[PDB]
Amino acid sequence: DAEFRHDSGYEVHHQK
């Protein structure tokens, strides 16, 4: 959750 706190809304910047 440290980085992935947008699990309920994945976006482009969150590409990994």
User: Which residues make up the interface to Zn ion (CB under 5 A)?
Assistant: 6, 11, 14
Q: Is 11 annotated as a binding residue?
A: no
Q: Min. distance of Cβ 3 from Zn ion in angstroms?
A: 8
Dihedrals φ, ψ of 3, to 5°? -100, -40
User: What are the C-alpha distances in Å from 10 to residues 1, 2?
Assistant: 13, 14
Q: Is 10 annotated as a binding residue?
A: yes
Q: Is 13 annotated as a binding residue?
A: yes
List of residues 6+ apart from 1 with CB closer than 8 A: 7
Q: Min. distance of Cβ 11 from Zn ion in angstroms?
A: 5
Q: Which residues are annotated as a binding site?
A: 6, 10, 13-14
